[PDB]
Symmetry: D3
Subunit: 239 residues, 6 copies
C-alpha cells in the first residue's frame, strides 16, 4: 500500500521473549510479537527477524565464568536457533510462511543462510528469521543483525530495547531527558551515545544502514513506524 520502509529487519534481545518469566519463552510475549510481525507482513513489508538467545543461555550453570568464551558463544548460538524455531511455529500457526536460516550449518533443523536465498524468500512474502549471528564467536547479536540487514539490503534496521529511543540523560537519572528525533552516525559517536557495541556500529555506519532504536511495548508500533510515525530515535546519514 503506502510503506515508508519496504524491507525491514527487527532485532530483539530474547530476554525480551522471557516476559515476566525468569527463563525460556513466555507464550504471552511471543504471541504479541508474532502478531506485530504478521501485521507488518500483511501491510506489505517483507520482514526479517533476529532474536538473541539470552533467555536460554542463562544461570551460573551457563553464563557464569570459566566457561570457555568460545564455548559460551556456541551455546548462545544454539539458543538463538531454539528461539528461532519457536517463532517459526507461533507464526506459521498464524498463516505466515517462515524461513529460519542459520549462520552455522544445522541442516536437519533449519536451512543455511545464503544471501541469495534469503532475498528470494523475502521477495516471495516469507518471514526471514536469522539465527547464530555472524557465525563466529566474539560478535554480538547486533553485529549479526547489522550484517544480515546489510546483506538483504534492508530499508531499516529496528533495534527494540527497553528504553524507547536514545536519550541525552537516562530516562531515569533525570526527569527532563529528551528523546532525539534523529541523529547521524557521527552525532552519536561525537556525543558518546551508545547504541550498539563499537564493531556493530561501524558495520552499520560503513553501509549507512538506517537504524531505529525503540520500545516495542505498545501494540501497533510496527504499523505506525511503517506508515511514517517518528517513533524512537532514527540513526542515519553521516554529519
Amino acid at each position: 500500500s503506502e510503506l515508508s520502509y519496504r524491507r525491514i529487519l527487527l532485532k530483539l534481545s530474547g530476554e525480551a521473549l522471557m516476559g515476566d518469566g525468569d527463563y525460556g519463552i513466555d507464550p504471552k510475549v511471543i504471541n504479541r510479537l508474532a502478531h506485530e510481525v504478521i501485521e507488518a507482513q500483511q501491510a506489505g513489508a517483507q520482514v526479517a527477524l533476529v532474536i538473541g538467545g539470552g533467555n536460554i543461555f542463562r544461570g551460573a550453570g551457563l553464563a557464569a565464568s570459566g566457561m570457555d568464551r568460545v564455548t559460551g558463544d556456541h551455546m548462545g548460538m544454539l539458543a538463538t536457533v531454539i528461539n528461532a524455531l519457536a517463532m517459526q511455529d507461533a507464526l506459521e500457526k498464524l498463516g505466515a510462511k517462515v524461513r529460519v536460516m542459520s549462520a552455522i550449518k544445522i541442516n536437519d533443523v533449519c536451512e543455511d543462510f545464503i544471501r541469495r536465498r534469503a532475498i528470494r524468500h523475502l521477495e516471495k512474502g516469507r518471514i526471514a528469521i536469522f539465527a547464530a549471528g555472524t557465525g563466529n564467536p566474539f560478535f554480538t547479536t547486533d553485529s549479526g543483525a547489522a550484517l544480515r540487514a546489510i546483506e538483504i539490503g534492508a530499508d531499516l534496521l529496528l533495534k527494540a530495547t527497553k528504553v524507547d529511543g536514545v536519550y541525552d540523560k537516562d530516562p531515569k537519572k533525570h526527569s527532563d531527558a529528551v528523546r532525539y528525533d534523529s541523529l547521524t552516525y557521527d552525532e552519536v559517536i561525537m556525543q558518546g551515545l551508545e547504541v550498539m557495541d563499537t564493531a556493530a556500529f561501524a558495520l552499520a555506519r560503513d553501509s549507512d544502514l538506517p537504524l531505529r532504536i525503540f520500545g516495542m511495548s505498545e501494540p501497533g508500533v510496527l504499523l505506525r513506524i511503517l506508515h511514517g510515525a517518528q517513533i524512537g530515535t532514527l540513526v542515519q546519514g553521516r554529519s
Copy 2:
C-alpha cells in the same frame, strides 16, 4: 584392569542437571557428576555419556503442549548439545580428554557421530559425549542411548533415574517393592514394568544389552558398580 564392565555408557535425564534451579543447570551437580566420570576413566574404563535436554527444553513457552512434535524434538536435540558442551568444558578443566559427537551435523560446535571414530576415541581413553539422540524425531533419549551403546559395543548401559532401581509398583505404595537384583528381558515385558519406552527397550533387547537402572545419589556409586557392586537392578538375558 579388573572391572566388571569395560566399555560403559551413562545416561542422565538432564532435568537432573537442574538440581536446585527449575531451569538450565547448576554447577554443583555438574562438577560432581564430572568427578564421578573422571573417576571411572581413572579406574581404566571407557566411558560414554548421553544426557537429555528437558532441563533446557522446558517451560510453557518452549515445550508448548500444542506444539509441532518435530520442531519440538529438534529443540530438544539442540538442548542436548548445549548440555553436552557444558560437560565437555567442565570435564576439560579437570584435565580429561573428551569428544562431543552429534547425531545431527553441527561441525562448528562439535564433530559428527561416526561409529568407527567414536570407538577409536574410546580406545585412546577419551570420553565420548553423544548428543541429539538418534538424530530422528519421535525417538526418546533412551533410544539414542541404547543405539549408541550397541554401536560402540558397550558392555553396560547405565541409566541413572529418580527411583533407585526397578520396583514392583514403586517405593512406599504397597509393602515397599523388593528391588529385583536382576530381571531378564521377557520378564519385564510379561510383568509390564517400565524401564524404557517400548521402542528403546526393543532395541536394547534385540542386541542383548545389559542395562542397569539406578540412582546416582551417593558419590562413588559409579566406581563401585564397575568393580562388581550389585547396586540398583540389572536387566539381561531371556
Copy 3:
C-alpha cells in the same frame, strides 16, 4: 478428491522386486509396480515409496552370517538407494515427477531427506521415494517407513507383504484361518500377532498411524484401497 486416503506411503520389501529371479530387479515387477503408483497419483494420491534392499544385499558374500552388523546395515542402506534410483527412472519414463530422498547424505546421487522439503514435494504432485531407512543401523525398513509416514502426515501406511492381511490362526497351518478386516494396536499386541518388529510397531503406535497390511497380488489393488476397499487388514486405534 475422488478417494478416501490422499497422502499415502507404500512400503515393500524389495526382495519383492526380484520376481522370479534370485537377485536383481525384475523388469516385469518394476514396470507393474510403476503403473500401480502412476495410477494412484493420476487420481490425486500424494504417494511416498519405501522399498527394502534384500534383493541387492543378498548372498553369502554380502549378507555373511558373521560380518559387522553395522557395515551390513550400511550395505542394505546403499542397496535401497539403488532400488530407489531404479524406481525413479521407471516412474519418470512414465511422465512422473520423482524426488528420491535418502536418510544418509549422498547428495551427488539424490537429495538429502528433509521433512519440510518432502511435504512440499508431495503437495506438488511429486512421488517421494525414501531410502536408507531411519539413517541408523539396527533399525528395520519398517521403522524407517513408520518414521517417514508420521513425518509426512500420511493418512495411511501400506505395508505390502506375502500373507494378505492378518489372520487369527496361521493361514498355512489351517484352512480355517479367518482374515480380519481391522484390528487395534492393542488387539494385535494382546493376540501376540506380528505385523512389524516391536520398535517399528511401537513408533506407529505412538502416532496411531493407520496401518494397512495387505498383499499386492493383482493390479488395481492399490487404487481400490484408496477408495475404501476392505482389503488386507487395517490396524488403527488405541482400543
Copy 4:
C-alpha cells in the same frame, strides 16, 4: 628394498568378486584376494585398491538397456561402495588396517576422498580402497583407477583381467595367439589393441604411469610382479 615398486594401485573388475556365482560376492574369492593383498602389504608395499561394481550392478533390472546413463553410473558407483565395504571387512578380519575412500560424499558409510589424506594413509601402512571412480558419470572405473594412481604417485598401475596380459588375437580365436611382454602406449593404439577406454588410457600415458595388465592366475602373482617378475603385459613409454 627388494621391491621394484613401492606404491601400487591394483584395479579389479567387480565380476572378479563373484567367482562361479552369478551375483554378489563369493566369500572364498574375496578371501583369496584379501590374502594376496596382505601378502603384498607385508612385503612392504603400499597398496591402493580399486574394485568395480559390475557384480552388483548387473541383470536386466538394474543394468536396463535404455536407462538414464547418469542414473546408471550412480548405481554403479554405489555398487562399488558396497564392494569396498566388503573388502574392508575381509581385510580387517585378517588384521590389516584399511581406509575406504569414496569419490562422492557418504560420510556415514565411509570417509571422503582427499588426496593428502590418502597419501598419508598409505605412508602409515594402511590399505587404501577407493570407491565411486572419478565421481562423475560417463567415466569408467579404469579412468578412476588411473586418476587415483597419479594422485597418490603410484609407481605402478595394475589391471587384473581374465586373460593374463595382452594377446594379439583373443586366446580363443587363433590358437597361435601371442602375448606381448612389453608395449609402448603408442604401439597399443597403433595395433588397435584394446587395453583401456581411450580417455583412461590417455590419462595413464600423459601421467607417465607404467601399466601392467595381468591375470591373477595363482597365489603369489601379485608379490612376484612386485619383485620385478615379468607376468602378463607391461604398457610403458611412448613411440
Copy 5:
C-alpha cells in the same frame, strides 16, 4: 528472434580464461567481460538456453602462481578457484543487464555458489536461466575442455561451442599453407584420422562417446554467436562418425 529460426536450442559455450584478459596481462578486462555478456544475453533473447564455461588461465598465471615445478594438483585447485572467480564476475555483469544467472561449481563452495547438480542445472535451463559452470569436473588432471564436454552431455546440449584463436579447423596449417581451407564440418573420425587437434585426447573421446556436436570457432566480431544459432556456417562443425 523468432524461435522458429533456432538451429540449436540448448548450448554450452566454452572459453579459455585468457579470453577475459583482452589486452592486459592478467585478470579481467571489463571491456571484454561486457561484450561477452552482451553476446550471451543476445543468444538468450533469440530463445536459447545458455550454459557457460570459462577457464581460469587469466588468474592462475605468472611465475609465482603457475610455477613450473609446483604440485600439479594444488596447481589444478588453484585453477579451479580461478574459475570460480571468473564465473562470479560473469554473474555480476550478466545480472546487471537483467539476466538471471546461476553459478554451479564441481567442488562444493556453498557460501559462494550452488554446487553442480545435473537435474538442477537442467531445470535452471528450462526456467530460462544462464548456467555458469565452474571448476571443471572437480578432479585434477582434467582440462577445462573435459569439464565442458561433460557438462554439455549432462545437460543434453544440442551443441558445444569452443571459442579459440583460430576461426575453425583447417585442412592444413594456414600460417604455413596459403591454399589451406576451413572445413565446414568433419566427423569425429575424420579428425582422428587426419591427426587434427580439436581438444585433448581425453575430452575428445568423451565428446565422441556421446556424439556431442562441437563447433570450433572464433569470437572475432560481435553477432557471431547469434548467427551460429540461426544456422550460419561459421567455424567448423564436428559431429558423427
Copy 6:
C-alpha cells in the same frame, strides 16, 4: 627456549606478495617469506599466518567499483585461498608441515577452520594458514586476522605493513616523522592514528590482543621480534 612470544599470528597484505609485479605472486618475495616463517618455527614459535588477496582480486575487471559488494568480497576470499595454497607449497618445499584452513567450506582444496583443530595443529608444530577471513562480506582481512588470533590464544598478532610501525605523520616524505615504540589501545583512538579499521580494532581491543605493527624490510626481523627485540610499534594495554 628463550622466546618472548610462544604463539603468533603474522598478517600480510597480499600485494606484499607481488614484489615488482602488478599482480600475482613474485616467487622471490614468497620464498624469503617462507624462510622467515620457517626460521620463526625452528626457534619454537607456533606460527599462524594470514595473507590478503589484493594481489589477485584487483583490476577494474575483478575489483570493479560498481560491482556487488558481497560477490566482490567472495572473489577476495577465493583469492586468499589461492595465496594460501601457494604459501603451503613453498613452505612444504622447505620441509615444513602446513595446515591451510579456510573460513568458508571448500573441502576439496583445504580443510575447514575449526578452532580446536587449529589449536591442535599448532601444538604439533604445524604452520596454520588461515584463508577467507571471517567468512562474511563487509569484514576486512584485519578483522579476520584479529579473530583467528584471539580464537587460537595467540600471544602476539604481528601486522606487516608498508612502513616500519605507527608514525605521527608519513615517514616516506618526512624525515621529521616520529615513530611510537608502544601505544595503548585508548591512545590510538584519541590520537586518531590508523592501525586497523574500526571493527577490527574493537575486536582486537576487547580481548586486549597485543599488536605489533612492523615492516618486514630486512630478513631476520621476525626472529628478532620473537626474541624480545623492540621493532616497529607495539599496541597493548587499556590506560
